[PDB]
C-alpha cells in the first residue's frame, strides 16, 4: 500500500476541544444533551469515592476508579440511542466531546447497557475505541467484574435490583477526573475545580433554563469518601 492515513481519532478529538475553550460550556452542553432527550430533571455530582481495583477488565482499568463527575437524567435511551457524523457519540450533538477535557475515558449507563469510550483506543486493543457491557447478556460478566461495575450502583436510585433486573430507566454518566495529562488533553481536575464549574452554572442561573422547555430541575452535589452527601445548589423554573 501506497497511500495517506489521516491522524489518529484523538488528534480530531483534540481539535474539537479548541472550540469549546471555557470550563462552564461543560456542564451546559449536558443540559442541552438532557433536553434534547427529553429529559425533565438534570443532576450533577462530584462524587470522591474510591472504588476497588481487583476485579477490573484488566490492570490499566485502574487509573479510572477513582473521583468522578457524574450526571444524571430522567430519560432513557431506546435502541437506536445505543447504535447511534463519525465524530460523535451515539445521537449526541458534537458539544457532548468537551467532556473530553475533564475524562479520557467518559462512561454511559442507559437502560440494559453500559459504555466507556476510550478514544486513545489503548485500553480494549488497537482499533477499539471503547467497550460496551449488555446488563442482561453479559450479567456473568458484570458480575465477574465487581470492581469495575460498583461504580454504576448506590446512586441516582441505581441498585443491586437495577443489575439484576438489566434495566436502569434513566441514564448515568460517570466521568473520571484525569490522573495524568493524555494526548486529548492535560487538564488534571480536583474537587475545587468541579466547584468552580457549579458555581459558575449557579450564577449564570438566570440563563440556564432561560430557554428550555423539558428540563425544569437541575440539582449539584457533593458526595465525601466516607459516604457523606449534600446538595450544593439547585436552579428551578
Known amino acids: 500500500s501506497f497511500g495517506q492515513t489521516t491522524p489518529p481519532l484523538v488528534d480530531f478529538l483534540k481539535d474539537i476541544l479548541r472550540r469549546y475553550p471555557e470550563g462552564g ?125 460498583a461504580p454504576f450502583v448506590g446512586i441516582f436510585g441505581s441498585t443491586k435490583e437495577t443489575f439484576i433486573n438489566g434495566n436502569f430507566p434513566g441514564t448515568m454518566f460517570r466521568f473520571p477526573l484525569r490522573l495524568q495529562p493524555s494526548q486529548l488533553s492535560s487538564n488534571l481536575y480536583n474537587k475545587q475545580m468541579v466547584l468552580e464549574l457549579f458555581e459558575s452554572f449557579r450564577a449564570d442561573a438566570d440563563t440556564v433554563l432561560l430557554f428550555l422547555k423539558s428540563v425544569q430541575d437541575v440539582s449539584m452535589y457533593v458526595r465525601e469518601a466516607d459516604g457523606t452527601e449534600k446538595l450544593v445548589f439547585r436552579v428551578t423554573s
Open 25 to 149: 460550556q461543560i456542564l451546559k452542553e449536558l443540559i442541552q444533551n438532557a433536553e434534547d432527550a427529553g429529559a425533565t430533571e438534570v443532576k450533577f455530582l462530584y462524587d470522591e469515592t474510591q472504588y476497588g481495583t481487583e476485579t477490573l477488565w484488566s490492570k490499566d482499568m485502574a487509573p479510572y476508579q477513582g473521583p468522578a463527575l457524574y450526571v444524571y437524567n430522567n430519560a432513557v435511551f431506546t435502541p437506536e440511542d445505543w447504535h447511534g457524523d463519525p465524530l460523535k457519540v451515539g445521537r449526541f450533538g458534537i458539544g457532548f466531546n468537551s467532556v473530553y477535557h475533564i475524562t479520557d475515558v467518559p462512561c454511559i449507563f442507559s437502560g440494559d447497557q453500559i459504555g466507556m469510550l476510550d478514544p486513545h483506543q489503548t485500553l480494549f486493543g488497537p482499533h477499539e475505541s471503547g467497550q460496551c457491557w449488555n446488563l442482561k447478556d453479559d450479567s456473568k460478566e458484570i458480575s465477574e467484574l465487581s470492581d469495575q461495575f
